[PDB]
Design an enzyme around this catalytic site. Structure first.
Site, PDB file in Angstrom:
ATOM      1  N   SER A 111      -1.066  -5.237   0.008  1.00  0.00           N
ATOM      2  CA  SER A 111      -0.590  -3.823   1.395  1.00  0.00           C
ATOM      3  C   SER A 111      -0.815  -5.008   1.876  1.00  0.00           C
ATOM      4  O   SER A 111      -0.803  -6.177   2.437  1.00  0.00           O
ATOM      5  CB  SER A 111      -1.323  -2.552   1.184  1.00  0.00           C
ATOM      6  OG  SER A 111      -0.601  -2.380   2.149  1.00  0.00           O
ATOM      7  N   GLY A 284       3.746   8.280 -14.222  1.00  0.00           N
ATOM      8  CA  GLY A 284       3.147   8.012 -14.153  1.00  0.00           C
ATOM      9  C   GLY A 284       3.060   7.508 -12.913  1.00  0.00           C
ATOM     10  O   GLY A 284       1.826   6.953 -12.349  1.00  0.00           O
ATOM     11  N   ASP A 315       8.125  -0.357  -4.802  1.00  0.00           N
ATOM     12  CA  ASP A 315       6.338   0.338  -5.874  1.00  0.00           C
ATOM     13  C   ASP A 315       5.828   2.326  -5.607  1.00  0.00           C
ATOM     14  O   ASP A 315       4.888   1.791  -5.521  1.00  0.00           O
ATOM     15  CB  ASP A 315       5.017  -0.339  -6.419  1.00  0.00           C
ATOM     16  CG  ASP A 315       4.214  -0.744  -4.458  1.00  0.00           C
ATOM     17  OD1 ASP A 315       5.251   0.073  -3.623  1.00  0.00           O
ATOM     18  OD2 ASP A 315       3.669  -1.134  -4.296  1.00  0.00           O
ATOM     19  N   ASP A 355       1.912   0.651  -9.889  1.00  0.00           N
ATOM     20  CA  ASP A 355       2.348   1.560  -8.842  1.00  0.00           C
ATOM     21  C   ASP A 355       0.995   0.649  -7.093  1.00  0.00           C
ATOM     22  O   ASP A 355       0.557   0.170  -7.945  1.00  0.00           O
ATOM     23  CB  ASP A 355       2.012   2.610  -8.992  1.00  0.00           C
ATOM     24  CG  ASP A 355       2.836   3.641  -7.567  1.00  0.00           C
ATOM     25  OD1 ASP A 355       3.300   4.368  -7.130  1.00  0.00           O
ATOM     26  OD2 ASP A 355       1.724   3.681  -6.315  1.00  0.00           O
ATOM     27  N   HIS A 356       1.584   0.643  -5.895  1.00  0.00           N
ATOM     28  CA  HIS A 356       0.718   0.290  -5.171  1.00  0.00           C
ATOM     29  C   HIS A 356      -0.599   0.743  -5.263  1.00  0.00           C
ATOM     30  O   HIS A 356      -1.088  -0.161  -5.064  1.00  0.00           O
ATOM     31  CB  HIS A 356       1.645   0.780  -4.073  1.00  0.00           C
ATOM     32  CG  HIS A 356       1.260  -0.101  -2.175  1.00  0.00           C
ATOM     33  ND1 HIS A 356       1.874  -0.655  -2.464  1.00  0.00           N
ATOM     34  CD2 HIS A 356       0.634   0.249  -1.529  1.00  0.00           C
ATOM     35  CE1 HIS A 356       1.479  -1.181  -0.751  1.00  0.00           C
ATOM     36  NE2 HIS A 356       0.475  -0.365  -0.896  1.00  0.00           N
ATOM     37  N   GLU A 358      -2.055   2.100  -8.162  1.00  0.00           N
ATOM     38  CA  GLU A 358      -2.651   1.347  -9.501  1.00  0.00           C
ATOM     39  C   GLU A 358      -3.010  -0.293  -9.601  1.00  0.00           C
ATOM     40  O   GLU A 358      -3.761  -0.285 -10.045  1.00  0.00           O
ATOM     41  CB  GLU A 358      -0.834   2.149 -10.277  1.00  0.00           C
ATOM     42  CG  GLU A 358      -0.995   2.951 -10.773  1.00  0.00           C
ATOM     43  CD  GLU A 358       0.148   3.255 -11.785  1.00  0.00           C
ATOM     44  OE1 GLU A 358       0.845   1.544 -11.936  1.00  0.00           O
ATOM     45  OE2 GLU A 358       0.426   3.718 -12.243  1.00  0.00           O
ATOM     46  N   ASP A 363      -4.821   4.424  -7.971  1.00  0.00           N
ATOM     47  CA  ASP A 363      -4.634   5.744  -8.979  1.00  0.00           C
ATOM     48  C   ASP A 363      -4.367   5.154 -10.440  1.00  0.00           C
ATOM     49  O   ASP A 363      -4.499   3.735 -11.053  1.00  0.00           O
ATOM     50  CB  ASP A 363      -3.014   6.025  -8.811  1.00  0.00           C
ATOM     51  CG  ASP A 363      -2.348   7.613  -9.817  1.00  0.00           C
ATOM     52  OD1 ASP A 363      -2.591   7.989  -8.811  1.00  0.00           O
ATOM     53  OD2 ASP A 363      -1.100   6.817 -10.194  1.00  0.00           O
ATOM     54  N   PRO A 364      -4.918   6.052 -11.655  1.00  0.00           N
ATOM     55  CA  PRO A 364      -5.158   5.297 -12.919  1.00  0.00           C
ATOM     56  C   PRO A 364      -3.588   5.128 -12.944  1.00  0.00           C
ATOM     57  O   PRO A 364      -2.596   5.666 -12.968  1.00  0.00           O
ATOM     58  CB  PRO A 364      -4.760   6.445 -13.726  1.00  0.00           C
ATOM     59  CG  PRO A 364      -4.847   7.797 -13.225  1.00  0.00           C
ATOM     60  CD  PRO A 364      -4.716   7.052 -11.789  1.00  0.00           C
TER      61      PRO A 364
END
Ligand SMILES: [Ca+2]
Ligand SMILES: [Zn+2]
Length: 392
Positions: A111, A284, A315, A355-356, A358, A363-364
């Site tokens: 990030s 998800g 994302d 994802d950002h 994941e 996050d799982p």
């Protein structure tokens, strides 16, 4: 094969905390485990930096320098006077005093951490002309960070970095949603936001601004106060640097060093709507982003700002277009990866369907082999030649 023994240093974004914070729930690994530990266990010496999540990249870079070599954070007299915060910050022992004798490191940043990493390299190599001039004119001392001549970063890898900013900042309710995101990350760690914990839990490291959570104040109450503080209202903030205009301003001075390898990884967790051309969150995607951020990111256009359809893929937090390297206001070069990692340029490693959050395990995502991703990366970094020879 292994060509260098440089340690790896992990660096978070606009959320992030030390290894002892959040009751041990790691920013680097989250619900998946402990990435730093995995790397060390596999023979890749790895350390973790923790800097102000909401602070400017400049502040974070000064904090990173001190945290690396040891000493008291020095934000620069010129800078401190311009923005109205303290010149000196916290004191650190130094993770790698080895860097003061010639060692090098690889930085893996997520990030905003990618902007910070870039800026750290720029200050290390070139210093700050403004701070040098100010010290000469006013007879103040000067941190070595501002002198130039330090070449201790062998590589910088960025993951999900808003090199050109993120349009998330353009949401009319960004202020409230951004702090709700901090609450969401506290929730990931099983920490409540409406509870006045006496333990620190998540330290925002706002020593320069004189801000800290008070006795009896929950994160909800604290965040209310931060929203009306200079770490939210000034230009010397993550808020500003995260914006498209702010990122462009940073890009105008923070350039790629010819002496450093740069690797960029982009993330996406969206699909395109055929009738609207908008991008929508995939199944998800972290729950917060899916409801609160992704719809906006995937549909916000702004012609005069230069936000066209290329910006919609995202994302959940950052526009994918912004991630391969700095472009807006930048002279840096970006080359698509072809099997050869080139020096002094952004090696665009492509886009990964995660994802950002994941991608760091907060996050799982059972379909994302996070352990393999970081081990593969670590292997690649360890293969980099500290010196390249020219050849056919
Ligand atoms: Ca997920
Ligand atoms: Zn500052």
């Amino acid at each position: 094969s292994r060509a260098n023994d440089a340690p790896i240093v992990l660096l978070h974004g606009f959320t992030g905390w030390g290894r002892e914070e959040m009751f041990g729930f790691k920013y680097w690994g989250g619900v998946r485990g402990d990435i730093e530990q995995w790397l060390n266990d596999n023979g890749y010496r790895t350390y973790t930096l923790a800097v102000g999540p909401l602070s400017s990249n400049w502040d974070r870079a000064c904090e990173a320098y001190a945290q690396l070599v040891g000493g008291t954070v020095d934000y620069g007299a010129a800078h401190a006077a311009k923005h109205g915060h303290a010149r000196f910050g916290r004191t650190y022992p130094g993770l790698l005093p080895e860097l003061k004798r010639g060692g090098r490191i690889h930085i893996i940043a997520h990030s905003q951490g990618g902007q910070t990493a870039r800026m750290l390299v720029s200050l290390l190599e070139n210093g700050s002309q403004e701070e040098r001039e100010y010290a000469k004119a006013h007879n103040v001392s000067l941190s070595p960070l501002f002198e130039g001549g330090h070449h201790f970063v062998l590589s910088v890898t960025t993951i999900a970095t808003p090199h050109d900013g993120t349009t998330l900042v353009n949401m009319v309710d960004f202020t409230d949603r951004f702090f709700d995101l901090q609450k969401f990350v506290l929730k990931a760690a099983a920490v409540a936001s409406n509870v006045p914990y006496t333990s620190q839990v998540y330290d925002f490291k706002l020593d320069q601004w004189g801000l800290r959570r008070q006795p009896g104040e929950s994160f909800d109450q604290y965040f209310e106060r931060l929203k009306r503080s200079p770490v939210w209202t000034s230009t010397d903030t993550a808020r500003y640097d995260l914006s498209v205009p702010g990122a462009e301003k940073l890009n105008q001075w923070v350039k790629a060093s010819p002496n450093t390898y740069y690797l960029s990884f982009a993330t996406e967790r969206t699909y395109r709507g055929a009738l609207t051309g908008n991008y929508y969150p995939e199944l998800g995607m972290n729950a917060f982003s899916a409801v609160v951020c992704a719809p906006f990111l995937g549909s916000y256009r702004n012609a005069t700002l230069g936000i066209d359809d290329r910006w919609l893929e995202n994302d959940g937090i950052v526009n994918a277009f912004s991630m391969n390297g700095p472009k807006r206001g930048s002279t840096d070069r970006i080359v698509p990866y072809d099997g050869t990692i080139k020096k002094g340029v952004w090696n665009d490693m492509g886009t990964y369907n995660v994802d950002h959050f994941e991608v760091i395990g907060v996050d799982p995502n059972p379909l994302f082999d996070i352990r393999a991703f970081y081990l593969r990366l670590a292997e690649q970094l360890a293969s980099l030649q500290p010196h390249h020879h020219h050849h056919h």
